[PDB]
């Protein structure tokens, strides 16, 4: 039979799950400054946890933490967390143009005549780049939340066709389309620390130049055995339309972007003191800079 | 049993395969200069290997060899190559117009109101022409890579309807369409030499006026027995729209063109010296001129 | 149905295969200098890629790269390579002796009377040595290509029987025999760089003291989980024959050695620029020195 | 048929197995010094190989090596060893008390009236601690062999109930019970060196802060891929009994503890010299200090 003297055993490793969800408006043009070129593309870093745990303050559109992040921030920081899945779906595109003008007046923005204009989406699958800089080096987290920011992919690309000649992956987005991109985080470890407003924290992934760090008092755990499948962030630009006579149209578009992230947070132990054991297994996530773009290549 | 004194036999005729891929933007108008006529059409010489082995330099949009061609150029030149299949697919057409104007102002380019405008594509299947010249005789390889160039088909064709009355093959391309054209090269021989920037090198084909040349020290190998099926390059022009009262619209369009070519290159022999035997079987491909257009007719 | 706006996706990770083949003559004696001892043995480093990618210049018997290596050297260096399988087969042994002499004359070389003489082949399977030096420390790549070179295994081994008392693996080779030894390289990674004439580059293997290096900008990928099966190079010497009265015969032999290596080289990306992404995953192969011998022991 | 010239191949990697067995007496009290508190607990480090390879000298109860360890010490040190399984079984508890006293006299030790008193056994499964110190910092190996020693778990724990409120795992031991605890060592590697009298040598385990070291001339082999199941040592104290009026009983107990460890030792190679190859794969075991306690936490 049962042990009449069995003692209550405390739970170990139990956790909770929190889902983050939000919606945003994004606008895009041909990523040009004057005549079309192939120097920049808008970048959407889906791997940046910051884009999901933060939102915009209604009064000044500044970056502010979501109620959910705010309420579990302390627990995350101390006991650890994992990111299972996260992603975005862009849809409901609305094409725009600024080619109409009044006599002795300037061009004004309007809807487009038809639905022929489209957005171009790229991924560096052939291994062109390792590290890039934002066109503006003073970009803030708020800006990124407001919209994907421009990244210089080829400072010397006067030829606007460079992107379509170089990027391995390419697809178009037009009215009626739905474009979904997701990322699954590595779940072998628990990660510690908060997700600051100063630097992007990457959803746990291991490959190429990308790597997370070992615990303060513990061995590093990672996939050393083989090359993992690399994950690519996306780059975009409204397709730059040139006419047969060299005329360049002024087109752009606005889309709705729905975001989601599934977070799992570790619970504190039973008792009345903060433990210390987690120092042996809590890994430190990889981080970057608001004005930098790191592309993973495992092959 | 096996021969205890068998010696290692060296491989013979082994080769490697390289695929070339790229994407480009093309623009077209009614191929006119003032009032519509039927004198010129844009030509897309899919048989020109140069269009696949070269690309555009990002800094000045000049012709430059692709990394792939660059890395196998030497081997190709000396040991030989074959072209299996190559082609293009034009899609995502975006119709354009320059008929809108502001009071006391000129016409400006804009998207089109509807999707009714379309591109006309022709092939000389009935045997009208043998040799044509480009409208401009100083065209460069870079220009051809940038866009299909104009070719004079009927210097005396004041009547803009001449093309639709004369060309045996004709089809239209409009928004949503995909137009694919391919060519399969003759594979009975291996060909030598580089693909220069000065003159177009034709994908091996035999028929009519078109022919490749014999090896330096060897017999010519070709299909002498029968007439092969001729291959036609395409000619285009945005359909020239005239109104009931003689008004002529200013229409054009931009499309995306994806290119591919499958190349097979012969490997050098085992050992430490360049051989000489290939001189007996390496044929010389047919070549043309950047300002000329040769049409094949085997029947 | 299909997407009317699908774009061409570029190939990724495609590669080519190159096989290297050659034949050589090797000669061996009892590895002695005067009276027999057990200090040296000829070594055949099958793991040295240099032995397969290089050959001998016909004019001066110096080391020179094979046409095949020469034509892919640049691509290998920049985009990466792997070695699948490589090896040698020694056969057609011809026993020799220098025991016959003319009155008031010296000994002269001749064929042997019978086929009783034989070659001894060893492998250090019991873990005797880690690192050894060549008897002559000024050995060149050309010498190694010309013939297996002497390596000092026991500087204090006056007793010529030491090798047969110590080496764990041993087999004999005589007329009619075929002795094949192969090595399979690790294929989890791509490796960069050329194979110089100055230092031996090892076919990728991981174990014991042997290890390859991490990419410039990427994580190291290797089998950390377990001990791999170690690979042993071979050591030889014509069996030293002593008579009942201490007389020492002067025997040797010549064999034919056929070599082969299967190389796989990565192709450059589509486009007109050299990429940089490979810096994240191209590992650096292990290298040694022409006058050193490293033996692997994983158990 | 068989090769008439086949040579004897030497054995490789062969080994021998040695089992260690012993019995001891352990005594325990409430781990207090005056009034009950929750600052210390007796610790039994089953992972310390020293507890199995050493015993007590009959003349002075000092630590001395067992005949078995003594006879294989040299071989272990040089050629390597592994620990498969080891453990203890505590049984035959005899409860004690010192609450009886004579008029105008002090308390004297006696058996207990009934079998209600019991021992408490804990394991830090919830990750409370990483590193602890022994109550006395001058503890010797002999002391540990003589009995489990006190370790300070909470220097500020005046509240004697702290242990039962904090430790995740807890069970009781009373008359008639048998408490068995075992540990299985990692067997992927061979380990070298002796097991000194100065510092505890841990049975090979990898996880959290715990790790073994790489060979002198070889790659480190360990489970990097995932978090292993951590192993916990035990902590004890006779249950501190307080009466309804605050009276504190003086209880304790004595048990018999049977120990065992299965060791596998590698044999030297055939021949007449000590080899050197083992330097490439013999790992170095993790070690600690006689006055320290390291707790593993992999999650
Ligand atoms: Ca916005
Ligand atoms: Ca163009
Ligand atoms: Ca030779
Ligand atoms: Ca005792
Ligand atoms: Mg605009
Ligand atoms: Mg980044
Ligand atoms: Mg126009
Ligand atoms: Mg032509
Ligand atoms: Mg001789
Ligand atoms: Mg070596
Ligand atoms: Mg007592
Ligand atoms: Mg310890």
Short mmCIF file of C-alpha atoms in Angstrom, two decimals, chain A residues 55-165:
data_model
loop_
_atom_site.label_atom_id
_atom_site.label_comp_id
_atom_site.label_asym_id
_atom_site.label_seq_id
_atom_site.Cartn_x
_atom_site.Cartn_y
_atom_site.Cartn_z
CA UNK A 55 3.72 48.76 -28.14
CA UNK A 56 3.04 52.46 -28.64
CA UNK A 57 2.01 54.94 -25.94
CA UNK A 58 -1.21 56.62 -27.15
CA UNK A 59 -0.13 60.12 -26.14
CA UNK A 60 3.19 60.40 -27.99
CA UNK A 61 3.58 57.22 -30.04
CA UNK A 62 6.69 56.35 -28.02
CA UNK A 63 7.73 52.79 -27.18
CA UNK A 64 6.17 51.46 -23.98
CA UNK A 65 5.90 47.95 -22.56
CA UNK A 66 2.67 45.99 -23.02
CA UNK A 67 0.61 45.25 -19.91
CA UNK A 68 1.43 41.58 -20.33
CA UNK A 69 5.18 42.10 -20.53
CA UNK A 70 4.96 44.54 -17.62
CA UNK A 71 3.23 42.03 -15.34
CA UNK A 72 5.67 39.16 -15.98
CA UNK A 73 8.83 41.16 -16.56
CA UNK A 74 10.18 40.49 -13.07
CA UNK A 75 9.47 36.76 -13.19
CA UNK A 76 10.97 36.48 -16.69
CA UNK A 77 14.10 38.31 -15.66
CA UNK A 78 14.76 36.13 -12.65
CA UNK A 79 13.43 32.68 -13.44
CA UNK A 80 13.67 32.37 -17.21
CA UNK A 81 11.64 32.18 -20.39
CA UNK A 82 11.35 30.61 -23.86
CA UNK A 83 9.83 31.78 -27.11
CA UNK A 84 8.00 29.00 -28.92
CA UNK A 85 6.56 30.65 -31.99
CA UNK A 86 6.14 34.20 -33.27
CA UNK A 87 5.30 35.90 -36.54
CA UNK A 88 3.42 38.37 -38.69
CA UNK A 89 0.80 38.39 -41.37
CA UNK A 90 0.59 41.38 -43.67
CA UNK A 91 -2.66 41.86 -45.55
CA UNK A 92 -5.22 44.32 -46.90
CA UNK A 93 -2.74 46.24 -49.04
CA UNK A 94 -3.87 49.65 -50.30
CA UNK A 95 -1.78 50.94 -53.26
CA UNK A 96 -0.92 54.66 -53.31
CA UNK A 97 0.44 57.18 -55.80
CA UNK A 98 1.58 60.79 -55.98
CA UNK A 99 1.69 61.31 -59.73
CA UNK A 100 -1.40 63.50 -60.11
CA UNK A 101 -0.93 67.26 -60.05
CA UNK A 102 -2.86 70.48 -60.55
CA UNK A 103 -1.84 73.21 -63.00
CA UNK A 104 0.96 75.25 -61.48
CA UNK A 105 0.85 73.03 -58.43
CA UNK A 106 2.71 70.12 -56.91
CA UNK A 107 1.86 66.42 -56.84
CA UNK A 108 -0.62 65.19 -54.26
CA UNK A 109 -1.16 61.74 -52.75
CA UNK A 110 -4.17 59.69 -53.85
CA UNK A 111 -5.39 56.14 -54.17
CA UNK A 112 -4.10 54.34 -57.22
CA UNK A 113 -6.18 54.00 -60.46
CA UNK A 114 -5.91 50.20 -60.55
CA UNK A 115 -4.45 47.37 -58.49
CA UNK A 116 -1.42 46.74 -60.68
CA UNK A 117 1.18 48.26 -58.29
CA UNK A 118 2.85 45.76 -55.97
CA UNK A 119 5.36 45.34 -53.16
CA UNK A 120 8.58 43.31 -53.52
CA UNK A 121 9.73 41.06 -50.67
CA UNK A 122 13.27 39.64 -50.47
CA UNK A 123 15.33 37.21 -48.36
CA UNK A 124 19.09 36.76 -48.65
CA UNK A 125 19.11 33.01 -49.23
CA UNK A 126 22.28 32.86 -51.33
CA UNK A 127 24.47 34.38 -48.62
CA UNK A 128 25.16 37.88 -49.92
CA UNK A 129 25.43 39.73 -46.60
CA UNK A 130 26.48 39.19 -42.99
CA UNK A 131 26.00 42.60 -41.38
CA UNK A 132 24.26 45.78 -42.51
CA UNK A 133 23.56 49.23 -41.10
CA UNK A 134 20.31 51.18 -41.08
CA UNK A 135 20.25 54.12 -43.50
CA UNK A 136 19.83 56.36 -40.45
CA UNK A 137 21.99 55.41 -37.50
CA UNK A 138 19.88 57.07 -34.84
CA UNK A 139 16.83 54.86 -35.23
CA UNK A 140 14.86 54.12 -32.03
CA UNK A 141 12.74 51.20 -30.88
CA UNK A 142 9.67 53.40 -31.33
CA UNK A 143 10.52 53.89 -35.02
CA UNK A 144 10.83 50.14 -35.60
CA UNK A 145 7.48 49.58 -33.91
CA UNK A 146 6.01 52.33 -36.06
CA UNK A 147 7.32 50.80 -39.27
CA UNK A 148 10.01 48.61 -40.84
CA UNK A 149 13.12 50.78 -41.25
CA UNK A 150 15.46 51.25 -44.21
CA UNK A 151 18.68 49.25 -44.30
CA UNK A 152 21.53 49.91 -46.71
CA UNK A 153 22.16 46.71 -48.65
CA UNK A 154 24.48 48.10 -51.36
CA UNK A 155 25.88 51.58 -50.81
CA UNK A 156 27.25 51.60 -54.37
CA UNK A 157 24.12 50.26 -56.11
CA UNK A 158 23.17 53.09 -58.45
CA UNK A 159 21.41 50.45 -60.59
CA UNK A 160 17.92 50.10 -59.13
CA UNK A 161 17.64 46.56 -60.52
CA UNK A 162 20.38 45.27 -58.23
CA UNK A 163 18.00 43.74 -55.66
CA UNK A 164 16.12 41.59 -58.20
CA UNK A 165 19.40 40.50 -59.77
#
